[PDB]
Amino acid sequence: MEVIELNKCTSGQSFEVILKPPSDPSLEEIQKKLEAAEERRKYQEAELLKHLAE
Amino acid sequence: MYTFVVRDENSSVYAEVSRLLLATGQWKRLRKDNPRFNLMLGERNRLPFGRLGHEPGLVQLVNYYRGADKLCRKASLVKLIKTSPELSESCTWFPESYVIYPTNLKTDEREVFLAAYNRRREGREGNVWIAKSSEGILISSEASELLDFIDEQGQVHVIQKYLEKPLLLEPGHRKFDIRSWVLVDHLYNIYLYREGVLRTSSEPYNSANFQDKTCHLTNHCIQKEYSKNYGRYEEGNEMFFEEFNQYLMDALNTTLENSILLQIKHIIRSCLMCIEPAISTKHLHYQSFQLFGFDFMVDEELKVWLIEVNGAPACAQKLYAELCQGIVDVAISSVFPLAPTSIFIKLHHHHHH
Amino acid sequence: MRECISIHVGQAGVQIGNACWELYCLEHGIQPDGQMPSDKTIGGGDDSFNTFFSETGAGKHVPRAVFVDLEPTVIDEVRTGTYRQLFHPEQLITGKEDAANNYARGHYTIGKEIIDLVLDRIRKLADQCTGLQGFLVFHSFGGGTGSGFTSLLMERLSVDYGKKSKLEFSIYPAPQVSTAVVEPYNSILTTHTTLEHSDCAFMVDNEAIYDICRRNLDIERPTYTNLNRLISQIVSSITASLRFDGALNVDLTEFQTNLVPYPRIHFPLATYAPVISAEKAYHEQLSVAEITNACFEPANQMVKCDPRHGKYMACCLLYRGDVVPKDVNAAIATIKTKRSIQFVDWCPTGFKVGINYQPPTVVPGGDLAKVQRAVCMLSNTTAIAEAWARLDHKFDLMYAKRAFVHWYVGEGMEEGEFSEAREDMAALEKDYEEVGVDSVEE
Amino acid sequence: MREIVHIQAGQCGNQIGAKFWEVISDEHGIDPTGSYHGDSDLQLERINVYYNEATGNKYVPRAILVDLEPGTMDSVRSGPFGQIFRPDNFVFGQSGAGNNWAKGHYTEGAELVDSVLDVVRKESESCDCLQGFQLTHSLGGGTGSGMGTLLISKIREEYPDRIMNTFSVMPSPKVSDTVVEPYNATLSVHQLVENTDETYCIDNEALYDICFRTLKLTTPTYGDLNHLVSATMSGVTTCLRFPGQLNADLRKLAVNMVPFPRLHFFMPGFAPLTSRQYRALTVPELTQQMFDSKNMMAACDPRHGRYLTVAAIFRGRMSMKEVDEQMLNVQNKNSSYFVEWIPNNVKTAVCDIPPRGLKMSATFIGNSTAIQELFKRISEQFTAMFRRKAFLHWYTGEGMDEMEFTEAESNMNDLVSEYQQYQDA
Numbered sequence A: 001m002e003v004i005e006l007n008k009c010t011s012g013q014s015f016e017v018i019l020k021p022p023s024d025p026s027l028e029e030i031q032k033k034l035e036a037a038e039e040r041r042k043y044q045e046a047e048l049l050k051h052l053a054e
Numbered sequence B: 001m002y003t004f005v006v007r008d009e010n011s012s013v014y015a016e017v018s019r020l021l022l023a024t025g026q027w028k029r030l031r032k033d034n035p036r037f038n039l040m041l042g043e044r045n046r047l048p049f050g051r052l053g054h055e056p057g058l059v060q061l062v063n064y065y066r067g068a069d070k071l072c073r074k075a076s077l078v079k080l081i082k083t084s085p086e087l088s089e090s091c092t093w094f095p096e097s098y099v100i101y102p103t104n105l106k107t108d109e110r111e112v113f114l115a116a117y118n119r120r121r122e123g124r125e126g127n128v129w130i131a132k133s134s135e136g137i138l139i140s141s142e143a144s145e146l147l148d149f150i151d152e153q154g155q156v157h158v159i160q161k162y163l164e165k166p167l168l169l170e171p172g173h174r175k176f177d178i179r180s181w182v183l184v185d186h187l188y189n190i191y192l193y194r195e196g197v198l199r200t201s202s203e204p205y206n207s208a209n210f211q212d213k214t215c216h217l218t219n220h221c222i223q224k225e226y227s228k229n230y231g232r233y234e235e236g237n238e239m240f241f242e243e244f245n246q247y248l249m250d251a252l253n254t255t256l257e258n259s260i261l262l263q264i265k266h267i268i269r270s271c272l273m274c275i276e277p278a279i280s281t282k283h284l285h286y287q288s289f290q291l292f293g294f295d296f297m298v299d300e301e302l303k304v305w306l307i308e309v310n311g312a313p314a315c316a317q318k319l320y321a322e323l324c325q326g327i328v329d330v331a332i333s334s335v336f337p338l339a340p341t342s343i344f345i346k347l348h349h350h351h352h353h
Numbered sequence C: 001m002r003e004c005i006s007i008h009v010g011q012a013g014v015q016i017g018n019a020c021w022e023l024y025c026l027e028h029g030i031q032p033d034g035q036m037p038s039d040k041t042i043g044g045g046d047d048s049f050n051t052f053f054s055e056t057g058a059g060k061h062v063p064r065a066v067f068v069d070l071e072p073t074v075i076d077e078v079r080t081g082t083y084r085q086l087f088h089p090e091q092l093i094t095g096k097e098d099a100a101n102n103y104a105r106g107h108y109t110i111g112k113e114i115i116d117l118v119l120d121r122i123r124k125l126a127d128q129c130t131g132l133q134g135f136l137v138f139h140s141f142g143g144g145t146g147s148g149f150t151s152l153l154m155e156r157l158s159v160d161y162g163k164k165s166k167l168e169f170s171i172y173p174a175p176q177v178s179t180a181v182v183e184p185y186n187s188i189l190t191t192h193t194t195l196e197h198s199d200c201a202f203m204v205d206n207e208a209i210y211d212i213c214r215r216n217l218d219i220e221r222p223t224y225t226n227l228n229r230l231i232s233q234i235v236s237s238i239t240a241s242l243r244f245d246g247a248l249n250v251d252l253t254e255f256q257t258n259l260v261p262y263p264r265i266h267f268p269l270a271t272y273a274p275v276i277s278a279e280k281a282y283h284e285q286l287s288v289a290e291i292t293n294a295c296f297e298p299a300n301q302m303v304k305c306d307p308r309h310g311k312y313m314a315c316c317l318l319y320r321g322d323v324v325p326k327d328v329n330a331a332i333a334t335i336k337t338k339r340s341i342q343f344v345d346w347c348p349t350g351f352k353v354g355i356n357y358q359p360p361t362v363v364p365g366g367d368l369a370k371v372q373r374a375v376c377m378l379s380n381t382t383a384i385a386e387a388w389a390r391l392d393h394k395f396d397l398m399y400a401k402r403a404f405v406h407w408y409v410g411e412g413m414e415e416g417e418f419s420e421a422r423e424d425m426a427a428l429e430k431d432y433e434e435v436g437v438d439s440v441e442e
Numbered sequence D: 001m002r003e004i005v006h007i008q009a010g011q012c013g014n015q016i017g018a019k020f021w022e023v024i025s026d027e028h029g030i031d032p033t034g035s036y037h038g039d040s041d042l043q044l045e046r047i048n049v050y051y052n053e054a055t056g057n058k059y060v061p062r063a064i065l066v067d068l069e070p071g072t073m074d075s076v077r078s079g080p081f082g083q084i085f086r087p088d089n090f091v092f093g094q095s096g097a098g099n100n101w102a103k104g105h106y107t108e109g110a111e112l113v114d115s116v117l118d119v120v121r122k123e124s125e126s127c128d129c130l131q132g133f134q135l136t137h138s139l140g141g142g143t144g145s146g147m148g149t150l151l152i153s154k155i156r157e158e159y160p161d162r163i164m165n166t167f168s169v170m171p172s173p174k175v176s177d178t179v180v181e182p183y184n185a186t187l188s189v190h191q192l193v194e195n196t197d198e199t200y201c202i203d204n205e206a207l208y209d210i211c212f213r214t215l216k217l218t219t220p221t222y223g224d225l226n227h228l229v230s231a232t233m234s235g236v237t238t239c240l241r242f243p244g245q246l247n248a249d250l251r252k253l254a255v256n257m258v259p260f261p262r263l264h265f266f267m268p269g270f271a272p273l274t275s276r277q278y279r280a281l282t283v284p285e286l287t288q289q290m291f292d293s294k295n296m297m298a299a300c301d302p303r304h305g306r307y308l309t310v311a312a313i314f315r316g317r318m319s320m321k322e323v324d325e326q327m328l329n330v331q332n333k334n335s336s337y338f339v340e341w342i343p344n345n346v347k348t349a350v351c352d353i354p355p356r357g358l359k360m361s362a363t364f365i366g367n368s369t370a371i372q373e374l375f376k377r378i379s380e381q382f383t384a385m386f387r388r389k390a391f392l393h394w395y396t397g398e399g400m401d402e403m404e405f406t407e408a409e410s411n412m413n414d415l416v417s418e419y420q421q422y423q424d425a
């Protein structure tokens, strides 16, 4: 059971004890995704307004 | 009204428990995938322990201990004994065992197995060993045939000293093993069912042909088919405790309790107390109980040897009624009370030192 | 000194943030009006507490924090309440109508219209930083904003601050306090899209906190206020190393280095002790051995699961109060021989330990008694995957019938995103299993 | 998500609508003159969901009153709270609709509808963030049913991204005005299936049975029926009207209650059942009663189907712990009746302010597949007549064709089939 890297200061201390050793999309792409979702909403809304028009 | 779900249709023990719970009129059975249950009678494989104990307003209990497979797997059990300090390599009641992976798989102990196999080549000592996997058995004093047979198969096997000097029932000059049923409840009380059974061989033992495996394997399956005297001495091949006891009193001037059961109780408690910290559900968000079947051999000096532990045992036909009732009594109603002379012996021992 | 910016998203993230900053102020002796007597360098500095607070020439210490919610009622209470003076108006950002417990509405529909404003507000804070380390992001899994807007924000943060670290504090859904049937959907969706953008995420299951409150604070029916005060103690334990003098986890990068060897498996389990009721008339103070032992009790974990049936990749113990190394090491020795603690083969069996001598600060009039010593253990154990399995099962149940799916498609999300997210989770569960488990009528 | 715009149409819609406003005005401390006189500030915290503020801190219902004849709106204006409504929000014609859906939807109502949308628009424009609309009407007459569904279509066209919510009174031969009620209701249901997000099904069959069997009213009047309805309406809108976490606006409610777009017809329930008693009711009693078929306002047996989703609301001062305990108890003990493929499908709210006259109350809103019983009933009444084309001249005379009848019937039978499908899934 070995203690290592013991560091002390006024506010406390730290160390390690070992018991045993080892046995991104760009802005462009994001905007496209947000715009495609928006267009899908727009299309569904247009379909509804067409149905209501009939 | 308590609720439960059945997820192992092929279990005789729990099919009977299920029936009894219904008959109390205070237990209702849900569809196997309804999660609003008090009690899960689980499946044998990949029981989803991770989904238990997250149902507000329900105390949840399950009929298996997560981790118990350590005891109940040939290879696991060997490892557990040899590497657990409280069991140790100095364990006098477990036959010398080694774990051996096939060559197609290649940790393994083949190396160390031969080391002791030699001292028995040299030693002149009985150098017969049995090999088995968790069908698929070979008994021989030639290691070459053992290791060979293992490599022919695809899964992990274990090589274990064959007990060449077993106790033999007379008349018959015949082998047998002892099965004992043990119920461990949610509190980790250990309960030994007071009735065990001897699965007997109906053929006379013989230590010259270890390939004639009908007088060497006491399994009730291998006896009902491959054996021509199935049922001659008992029905079959099953001798119970009252009789085996009378026999021990008449033939050997001893009792079942003194010559054998003390050792059995010691072994059961030692195995289960070993794994308790790894499987106990004491402070867990769901609780567990389990029925185990321990299988023992007895040598001619009346010494007991643990063969294996079964995590999902059946019971002897005439014993289901009582055992199963006992399970709902101590494992189920204990947690979920309904609106003696126990059939169980509580295994407990507090030696001070 | 390197700055950290905190980002609170949605109701859960905002209310938790409220509670953490209250506690920080108490710990650092910062008054509600933002003044800090004990701080002698007026109008600036590079003390450790400056990691979380900036300074004005008037001596005001201002959280490096942004609050974002798609509706105003929760943040309005920050604008109006005890610490109103702490926060600059530009730091408190609200929309008009919320995400209605719908990830797709939080991510695509409303996210698109507010995301640029949020970033520009974060940039303002970043501009005040000499050496920004990165971000700490507080949100629920189950809410529409917490799930959907956060994942959008995290993607854009990787784009605008590609080298900066990103840590999460995530609230995982529990039915006892949840507000929506679809929280499992929102959880998987957000985990899927955030996964590659988060370096280390501390999941808190409301079920666990709820029960700790009932059991150990004797609260009959915990509220968010009870929950968040407890959660804020655990969050303070975790971030104390960033805010005080010390040598362990002193910057965000060190969290990954110490707790996350495999980048997808970045969800350490937090376990905290002791939790004692302030109403408890007579209380015996618990030792180093006792509170250390309690770290291996599922009952004290932030997520109920069983570490005995998994493996460890890393373990850090963070103590506050009267603790010296020798007692920690004696406690560990004893615990090692009484418990199931298995590490993966390719890691050392060991503990990194931090001690700060100041015992936990509690809120005047709160539910928590003050104690002489406490500890937070952060362990990267495969057992936390139990939580993913629970979630993935609820998801599978509903999705097989497409229940509620139309709410999401109606927001412009494609159904296909459900199965991709689910498939990512399935891979995640499998990874944990490979790291965690060995291959295993009679 | 703040303002709701309320519309009440026809005789039934306006009579139940008036009562609603009387009841919640009372809860919020608002007097007939629009002056606030309450004691608790919980009353005013979310008052703007239903009321506009005028000068003198007068509060004015965001309510629009519609009818094709003046009679019932004259009554409303003379009623208890009649002066609280905005005078310009009374929109009425002179001709009536003769219990005829075609007159409401295509002829008499088409002439009036633009003036209604004019008032709807004026109300919507002064909303900081309109969440949507609530309409009270019956399905059995002409104006509420025919013109009410016309308005819904036009509102949707002008505000397609807002929530549309109705309290719809379903006809019963037991409490009936004319024989054409099944026609008017079938034609109306078709509209609702497509153009509302949430519909509380209020079955006059059930209201009558409750008054008769439970409240011991030998001769129930519409007034007695409407007592139950206003109590239910106050109940189901509690979460919208007071501070709270769960189902606090129309969109979150729909997201919690509607797994499939067309299955948005709810069975409301109320406890305790009261009529115009000092019995303290215990949390266990409220809970048992709120789930009791006899407390349900749609005449369907909940044991004949399964609950897809449930919202429960408890009001009064009581133990949150006991509330949670009791709700869990009902689910755990009757778990077969809640579909297993929507986990945790029951949600519970509590509000400290109870309704007038009671210390404790509970309101139940269920999305049960047993609601198909209501639509089957209407479907059988419709077919009995339609197979002989009986009474159809009243409709073909307003320009409608039989085909439209065939289509509305097919669509309602389809809806029945969709409930049966999830009852067996």
Ligand SMILES: Nc1nc2c(ncn2[C@@H]2O[C@H](COP(=O)(O)OP(=O)(O)OP(=O)(O)O)[C@@H](O)[C@H]2O)c(=O)[nH]1
Pocket: C009, C010, C011, C012, C013, C015, C016, C069, C070, C071, C098, C099, C100, C101, C102, C106, C139, C140, C141, C142, C143, C144, C145, C146, C147, C171, C172, C173, C174, C177, C178, C179, C183, C206, C224, C227, C228, C231
């Ligand atoms: N611990 C804790 N959980 C919270 C709190 N507020 C909400 N939650 C949980 O978070 C989930 C709901 O998400 P919210 O944060 O309320 O939703 P939101 O991010 O505001 O998203 P929308 O309201 O849909 O726009 C549920 O699981 C709640 O139990 C809180 O203050 N503390």
Ligand SMILES: Nc1ncnc2c1ncn2[C@@H]1O[C@H](COP(=O)(O)OP(=O)(O)CP(=O)(O)O)[C@@H](O)[C@H]1O
Pocket: B095, B130, B132, B160, B161, B162, B163, B164, B175, B176, B177, B216, B217, B218, B219, B295, B297, B307, B308, B310, C441, C442
């Ligand atoms: N090491 C050993 N020495 C002597 N006999 C042994 C032995 N190991 C096994 N046997 C014999 O082999 C039989 C056991 O087979 P085995 O241990 O593989 O059980 P099994 O897995 O085939 C069925 P079950 O799980 O129901 O007991 C016993 O009946 C016994 O007769």
Ligand SMILES: Nc1nc2c(ncn2[C@@H]2O[C@H](COP(=O)(O)OP(=O)(O)O)[C@@H](O)[C@H]2O)c(=O)[nH]1
Pocket: D009, D010, D011, D012, D013, D015, D016, D097, D098, D099, D100, D138, D139, D140, D141, D142, D143, D144, D145, D169, D170, D171, D172, D175, D176, D177, D181, D204, D207, D222, D223, D225, D226, D229
């Ligand atoms: N509950 C209730 N039902 C009503 C009331 N008035 C009429 N009804 C029912 O509503 C239907 C008739 O529609 P009605 O509103 O009178 O006609 P409209 O003016 O053309 O909309 C019938 O089913 C009546 O039973 C009322 O005040 N309360």
Ligand SMILES: [Ca+2]
Pocket: C039, C040, C041, C042, C043, C044, C045, C055
């Ligand atoms: Ca300073």
Ligand SMILES: [Ca+2]
Pocket: A024, C158, C162, C196, C197, C198
């Ligand atoms: Ca990154």
Ligand SMILES: [Ca+2]
Pocket: D111
């Ligand atoms: Ca005219």
Ligand SMILES: [Cl-]
Pocket: C160, C161, C162, C163, C164
């Ligand atoms: Cl960068």
Ligand SMILES: [Mg+2]
Pocket: B177, B295, B307, B308
């Ligand atoms: Mg055996």
Ligand SMILES: [Mg+2]
Pocket: B134, B308, B310, C442
């Ligand atoms: Mg076996």
Ligand SMILES: [Mg+2]
Pocket: C010, C011, C071, C098, C143, C145
């Ligand atoms: Mg919100």
Ligand SMILES: [Mg+2]
Pocket: D011, D012, D141, D177
């Ligand atoms: Mg009428």
Ligand SMILES: [Mg+2]
Pocket: D114
């Ligand atoms: Mg006009």
